[PDB]
């Protein structure tokens, strides 16, 4: 299987395998099953931004979910990801819709990584901005239901020709080139990523949410991975 | 009095005021005995590099100083300062020496902050990188002691014409711009710092340090604050 | 005696000192009679953008100031900044009305320039980035008419309570910090600027127009430069 | 059919194919025969700094290569890169050795391309540097006989376990993601790239070349273009 190391937000509670009971921004480290939560009132059909940060100093993932005009919601976890994902990776977005649906648009998505060797005390860096999706956007590999084009937007999952998202969709887009995300002997390694998105729904519930992931560099989307698996995991283990 | 927060690099142990046994770096917030310390392998006549880090999601001041090949040592202190510091302030490079000496030289220094709005989840920054320091450097405050230009370096400290650290000898140098460091309406802020320096001495014994520190935009070299003060702190209170 | 070099985005023909007979872009050099313009079909109401760029390879100072969905007005001039500005300097935003007038209202503005050194192939770099200004702004210089904070927007001339532009009225705002825009012993010097603006002129006759400048490091508004001086120059000569 | 534009480092004049009678800096448009060259006094064995600009203001492709405490040598050309390149790309460093040889070794590497879309004014950007090359670069699409990792450079060309070049080699490193060039929707596209290198032959006799390149996303290093073709071109027309 995959390794997968995720910041999710998850707009719908599947409380059967261990969501909290409402809307949330969750670290996942392995598993659909979050090390840690925190509340998110998530607004329909209003554009969010998430900031995500981890450095190797601290040794700590955070992420800040926002909306304008309201608190933010905030959730950290300590790990070491040296212990945790391959050296090189590939990042990404992934979303999902089930039973309930709802858009999962990007609007923009920026990253930036970089390591401070051991030995030169010199940086490698990498970074990334979109602010506008091209129909043939050659530095994204499409996976699954995701499409680029549609008002400049990236659109996770499925949503018809007049607006409607559909059920049981899910897709991904990941960045092309490999990243190099630690290093034994870097003194210094961190990253950050940025992305707008709108969330819009029809349903009584909007479901089932977006997720900001680093992954194995041949990572693809786990058979039946729609609904509450986020287009994540191959299982809620 | 001014307001002071600064990460030292202390390389005298004056434990009479409190600095642990061993030269050390530290988080200082509004006085010189250290909230936190770590041991470090100060390397005499090597150039070293610090890398500092805040970002008000985590609320921590984290610190990390080495050289090329060997452990670096590393630093952290929570604190929230938003409750310590003026909104506008300044940044800034101290140094000092007293009956021990050392030169204080800095190489290069560059500085970043970040502040984005919670209302409209823009962006402001300020950035700048210094490789190199002529000897009118108009983007720069000096105090004391502190000259510019001597093989294109900012030695912070006095030097003679051979090379030979003076004692007794306190200097510094601030960034020309005020820095908007925090922002009550901001969802995310943070900055970081880098400096590389090369602390060269002749003596049985180093002293005193160098020290990043981040004030009140009109700071100025207390009275009396050679030596173990770090040209930081008026007292050892 | 100032100098100043600028770029204008002059939306009233003063044909009596040489303007062309429509609005215009131009590239002015010591002098408010631009050595080079362009017809420019601004967009009363609306927001635009104005990018601006100078290396020392080329020697070219080139401007692009456009509004979404419309074609582009393109300037640009052969000039050896090393022979016109002092090694430092500041850089600032600059509007004027007069008989008639505008908001001349920012709503962003970066800027970045980098010099790397002959000696040692090192980069000295400022960049700052404003999308908010703020009431009490510490790292700009506001003079004449200019405020800040309103719509978290830098108003450069004097505008009512009800929102209408007056006339006879100058400001100005310019980074705190110099810069060091040129170094002959550097092997590349470049800069860069952008801002974005919201001209509107209720009766649909605006003057005078906005410039980005950079100009002797203590500069100041000249007198009597409201109208067609755009707050720059002494005299249309 | 490869469809390349480049900058040459040539340190070997091959005047049958049109080089001038020395060593030489150019911009190559779709073939070797540089459509403008600048003479260049090449340092053996002396680290020395490429810089390469270009933005769709001026449309002017410009270089300058020089080493420390040294005249640059500098070259520019006005192209319309919309009308020779393809709208997506890769970006690489080629190198090659043929009768004669030295050492390609690049010691860093940064490019940063962005793209600014003329219906929203929002910025694509694209930012790599590497200061340090392992081993096993994932980000880095190797080619012929290039090889990363030892004392953490880019060895385009062969050299032995003792130090010194071979001839008759070519290789070429390309940054693994596509980059978006050129967008004829966009108001202002621009990028520049920064690399530093060692070209060292034992025996004073050097050739024949290192070049930084853009090409067509599917290059290749075409048969035969060792020697004069510097890895680039598949014959001298
Ligand atoms: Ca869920
Ligand atoms: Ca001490
Ligand atoms: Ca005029
Ligand atoms: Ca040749
Ligand atoms: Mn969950
Ligand atoms: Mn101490
Ligand atoms: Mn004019
Ligand atoms: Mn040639």
């Given at each position: 299987?995959?390794?997968?190391?995720?910041?999710?937000?998850?707009?719908?509670?599947?409380?059967?395998?261990?969501?909290?009971?409402?809307?949330?921004?969750?670290?996942?480290?392995?598993?659909?099953?979050?090390?840690?939560?925190?509340?998110?009132?998530?607004?329909?059909?209003?554009?969010?931004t998430a900031?995500?940060?981890?450095?190797?100093?601290?040794?700590?993932?955070?992420?800040?979910?926002?909306?304008?005009?309201?608190?933010?919601?905030?959730?950290?976890?300590?790990?070491?990801?040296?212990?945790?994902?391959?050296?090189?990776?590939?990042?990404?977005?992934?979303?999902?819709?089930?039973?309930?649906?709802?858009?999962?648009?990007?609007?923009?998505?920026?990253?930036?990584?970089?390591?401070?060797?051991?030995?030169?005390?010199?940086?490698?860096?990498?970074?990334?901005?979109?602010?506008?999706?091209?129909?043939?956007?050659?530095?994204?590999?499409?996976?699954?239901?995701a499409?680029?084009?549609?008002?400049?937007?990236?659109?996770?999952?499925?949503?018809?020709?007049?607006?409607?998202?559909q059920?049981?969709?899910?897709?991904?887009?990941?960045?092309?080139?490999?990243?190099?995300?630690?290093?034994?002997?870097?003194?210094?390694?961190?990253?950050?990523?940025?992305?707008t998105?709108?969330?819009?729904?029809?349903?009584?519930?909007?479901?089932?949410?977006?997720?900001?992931?680093?992954?194995?560099?041949?990572?693809?989307?786990?058979?039946?991975?729609?609904?509450?698996?986020?287009?994540?995991?191959?299982?809620?283990?």
């Open positions: 299987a995959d390794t997968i190391v995720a910041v999710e937000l998850d707009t719908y509670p599947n409380t059967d395998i261990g969501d909290p009971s409402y809307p949330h921004i969750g670290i996942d480290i392995k598993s659909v099953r979050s090390k840690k939560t925190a509340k998110w009132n998530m607004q329909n059909g209003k554009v969010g900031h995500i940060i981890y450095n190797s100093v601290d040794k700590r993932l955070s992420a800040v979910v926002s909306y304008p005009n309201a608190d933010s919601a905030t959730v950290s976890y300590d790990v070491d990801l040296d212990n945790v994902l391959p050296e090189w990776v590939r990042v990404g977005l992934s979303a999902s819709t089930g039973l309930y649906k709802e858009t999962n648009t990007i609007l923009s998505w920026s990253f930036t990584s970089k390591l401070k060797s051991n030995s030169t005390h010199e940086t490698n860096a990498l970074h990334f901005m979109f602010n506008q999706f091209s129909k043939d956007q050659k530095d994204l590999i499409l996976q699954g239901d499409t680029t084009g549609t008002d400049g937007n990236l659109e996770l999952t499925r949503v018809s020709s007049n607006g409607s998202p059920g049981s969709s899910v897709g991904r887009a990941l960045f092309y080139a490999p990243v190099h995300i630690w290093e034994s002997s870097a003194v210094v390694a961190s990253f950050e990523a940025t992305f998105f709108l969330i819009k729904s029809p349903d009584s519930h909007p479901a089932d949410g977006i997720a900001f992931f680093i992954s194995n560099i041949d990572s693809s989307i786990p058979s039946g991975s729609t609904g509450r698996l986020l287009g994540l995991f191959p299982d809620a283990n």
